[PDB]
Amino acid sequence: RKRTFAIPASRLTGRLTTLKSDVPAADSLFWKLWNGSLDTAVQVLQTDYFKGIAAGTLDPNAYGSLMVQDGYYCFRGRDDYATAATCAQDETLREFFKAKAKSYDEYNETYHQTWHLREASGLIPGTDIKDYADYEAYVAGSLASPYMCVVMLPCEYLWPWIANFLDGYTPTNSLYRFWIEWNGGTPNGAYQMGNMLEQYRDKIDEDKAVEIFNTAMNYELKVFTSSTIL
Amino acid sequence: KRTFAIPASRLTGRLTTLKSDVPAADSLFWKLWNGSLDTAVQVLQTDYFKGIAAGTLDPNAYGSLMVQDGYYCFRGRDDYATAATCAQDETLREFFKAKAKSYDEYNETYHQTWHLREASGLIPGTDIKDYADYEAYVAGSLASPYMCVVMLPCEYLWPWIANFLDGYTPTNSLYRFWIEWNGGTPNGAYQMGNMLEQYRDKIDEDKAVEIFNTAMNYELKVFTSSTIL
Amino acid sequence: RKRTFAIPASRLTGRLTTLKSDVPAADSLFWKLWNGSLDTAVQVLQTDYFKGIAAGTLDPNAYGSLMVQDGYYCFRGRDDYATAATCAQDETLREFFKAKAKSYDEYNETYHQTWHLREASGLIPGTDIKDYADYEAYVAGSLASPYMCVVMLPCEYLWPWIANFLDGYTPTNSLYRFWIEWNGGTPNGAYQMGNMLEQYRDKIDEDKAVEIFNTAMNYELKVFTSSTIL
Amino acid sequence: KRTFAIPASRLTGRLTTLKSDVPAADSLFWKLWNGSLDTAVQVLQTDYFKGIAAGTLDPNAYGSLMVQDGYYCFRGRDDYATAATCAQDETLREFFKAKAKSYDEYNETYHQTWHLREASGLIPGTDIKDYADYEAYVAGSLASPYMCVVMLPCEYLWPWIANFLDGYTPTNSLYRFWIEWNGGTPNGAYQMGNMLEQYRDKIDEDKAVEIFNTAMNYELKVFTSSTIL
Amino acid sequence: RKRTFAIPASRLTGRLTTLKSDVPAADSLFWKLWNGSLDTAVQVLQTDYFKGIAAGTLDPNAYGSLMVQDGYYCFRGRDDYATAATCAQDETLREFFKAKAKSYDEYNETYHQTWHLREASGLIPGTDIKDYADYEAYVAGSLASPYMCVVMLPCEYLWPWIANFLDGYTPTNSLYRFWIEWNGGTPNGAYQMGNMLEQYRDKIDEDKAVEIFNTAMNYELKVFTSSTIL
Amino acid sequence: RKRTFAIPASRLTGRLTTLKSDVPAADSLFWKLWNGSLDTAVQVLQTDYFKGIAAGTLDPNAYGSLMVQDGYYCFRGRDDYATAATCAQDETLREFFKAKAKSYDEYNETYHQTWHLREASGLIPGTDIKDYADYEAYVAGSLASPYMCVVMLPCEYLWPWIANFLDGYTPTNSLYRFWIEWNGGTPNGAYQMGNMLEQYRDKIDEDKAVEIFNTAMNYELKVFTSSTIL
């Protein structure tokens, strides 16, 4: 129910035993990526979707339609981590990606059980979510391993960031307050992945990372924008 | 607008004279409904409908049920196609074919707004699975007119609930749309009631009562379980 | 304040010693009568009166004007049970009707004390309540004894049935929430009279009973309908 | 609209020139009102009127008091008839007769909307009974002009309260109708104040002050006890 | 922020040692003054200002603009008490006025610190507050000492009286509820000054006192009335 | 009571005849400055002040106390533009600064009339507003003319930007909705000044401009943060 894809302490084993979830350092690639896309994040806050969450007036049809599409996205994201693990040449990253896939499986129980969704092939994704998922699949299958951490970061950090921003704008007794509770708090999953990524910073092109990260951020905006157009 | 009525443009052939006016007081339609009214009242007593009226229904419950209703409607369409294929006579063949088409039109909402591809891509809850299975059994194993009986509850109950809850559901409240989409004159139900009346002498009314009551009770079970997440 | 006309345990004496208040059996005349008029009960829920109760917006003038008329009705009802006792077929029903009259006297203290109503003659009933009270007097004075249990059942069962229905529709902090509390709960008075009536089922014409019961139910609907037309 | 004013059509005979304009500042009318203004303020501090303004007055308290006000107004009408009978002054005889008729007209609300037949059919609470008994005493045992004194509070206090509470009582609130029914220009009070001024020299003003203050204090007592159920 | 100008027990020294804060006797000049202006107080309750306080809808710009003007008023009031001390030929009244000046200094810290107002000369008073402050300065500097107690009484008693009246009309969770809490309760300052005044009652003309008190009360009304006209 | 410091068409005379108020180009120094401080702007949205505005629950004392300090700030800002004009390095900037001082005079009528504030010397500014005002005076009097456009831009652009952000989070019937109406819409004043600045871009150090702009933005954050600490 708590939306997290963090690797829990019990599964920080093998090469992952020392992986930390503390806030990445200010000079990290994590913050460099996030700080460069902040204008996009602010635009997400200006969507009708999030104005609806804060006001408690989001059309429940918009909420649910988006949720089904997020199911599609998360089902495919799990598969992408599995693909990344298969493509990893580095054993640490292989273990990391295998653990992330498992974190997705656990979260995805919500989509199977509460939302009654069997699998991605049973859904007809909207254009934006399809394009976004296709992009992640391409990164996972065709680009070097550390870029997988880059492309998946926005969906792990943006949601908590939105929740923590909207917390003080969303009354405790309002209908979508649960969104804040389920997504807010410390973004330990994102931090964890940012700390993994920092270890491979010297093995990638940072300009390419920026482009990949910004593309995924733009997809988040497109998806939230289109979610209320029914 | 949730309707499965056959529109005027498709009342052709043997369906040309089929009417949508309120069935007569002595009709099998009202006999069936009247006998399950206690069940309908219990549907109004569900947390689901208290939540609709109050505007406080958990959006996760609303959506979770909607996905299952998609499953139900996809299978309902198939049941009508099954019933048409093995139909008795040509009037029912045409009627059931036209109903299947009305379901196809309505089901665009599940495909487009709710992004659901097909029934096999969903994992139904137990109650909706058992209900759908029961309608499939009626369509494929019982005489044709019983298909009108088993499908009538979903066509009449929903507008009836909406028309009841209309004056309890403020126009500015979050789930007011449910009243607007489901309420008004239940022309689809009446139309099928009027079709059924023409085959009344060809069925066992005790059996029809049992079938109708089973379906009504599935509606209650589905709405009851919808808010237990 | 608790609206009940049940005979309490302390007055279940003599021939009434073994009279029970448990739910009548499914094949009882009680359920046969109620089930046949359920469409009318649903229409009572559709009145502006009950929409107003649930929403907390019923005009206090409508609430009060109907209450005065219910005082008239209950004052007369008490006399109708006294009349029924006087005409009673047999000693058990004589005792039952005497005990019911006393239950009415006990409840009617609310009309004397809180509503400042002296007696029926001091009120000018509306048409619907007058007709309804006239019908009950007719049954009490002109028809066989067990029919008195039939005609009086709607007012004992309908009101708790309405309260129990509207309970989950009427917020606990709303202005007419008291209606739910005062009228809801187990309809023991109705059950008790249903159980009395079952014992005389063979002594009456059930079609005539249905007719009488449905007339009373229809008067309840007419009264609630007219209550908000001021 | 709660008014006991004598309408223009019945300002005939000796009443032809009676005016409803605001009494002059030096009038007995204002002298009486100004001396009891603390009591009027305490009426505004009752739970009754705090409930009116907030929309939260218990409907049972509202109704319970309304029945008692019916009793009071039925009796008030009889008091004016008694005052007409006992008046040897012709103008006051006509005035009281016309006031009795104004009460009859208003009292149709109690007969018709509240279904109350007559005073003898009601059991007044203690405060209302004492207040009505006091008015009946003034009407039947004191000099005629004192009747104008004792009846003024109920005619002026209620509009005054309504006009005070108007900006405190939202237009959409449940008891807003109280403001609309009782508020506006207190023409009936002014009319009686203007009648009273003409007999000022024929009464003891200290006694008038006592009588007026007694009635005002009964108003306070009645409103205070109305919400203790 | 508790709005009081009372002389606290610690400063009831010298000739003020025995000065009491109990409710003045019914025959006191204090109550004579108040009772004669009660119509004006009622009209203060009829202002849009207080209707706004009770409803929680007073324009925050009206609230603040008036507060600045009240700062001006209180700064000048403090000066008036110092002037009155200077003109007092009676020693007890000299001490009383000096102590009042100090109570104003203490209260006035709210205007310096919270509202960032330096001094009266830095403000541009509206016409009504200017006129009212000018009238108090005139009384202080040109009329016999005890009249200063008369002219300053309305601002000490009227506000608590209003707060205590509106308490039961102002929900505890409403935006301006603080007004009630800061001004309401026992008007000990007013009572104290009333008790001081009563000792000099024989030294003044009561008709003149009525005139002065009523003038001040009328200014209070004018000020509250104009406060919401922006 | 529209908060604008734009030079209106009627005063676009002489060297200012062709000065435009269109949105500056994407490559402009104006957007470079704003884009670099966006994190600070987002932190302004996270203050209790703006959460209060949106929710309608901002303490009216906090609202008003800040308004008085803004009066101080605007009184001093007007003088800074007069100073900048006096030591303007060319006639275009002299005319521009003179025109801005006049726009400030026009807006400042709200502080004199509605808020009853005579002049800056009559106010005691809080620490943050004092430091901010001192910084602008320093820029005006000690740095090259075009830097005055830089340091004044935040107060002209940030407020509209906030209002336009909060518009869809602030219900139309809420108590502080007027803040959105008064500050929101097209930031024509800011654009106009950005377009003036662009003409002097080659005459200044952009790194210094960034520093100055960020300092002012940070003062805005400090001021809003401290406004609700009473």
Ligand SMILES: [K+]
């Ligand atoms: K979520």
Ligand SMILES: [K+]
């Ligand atoms: K599938």
Ligand SMILES: [K+]
């Ligand atoms: K629906």
Ligand SMILES: [K+]
């Ligand atoms: K009577």
Ligand SMILES: [K+]
């Ligand atoms: K009334």
Ligand SMILES: [K+]
């Ligand atoms: K100054």
Ligand SMILES: [K+]
């Ligand atoms: K230019």
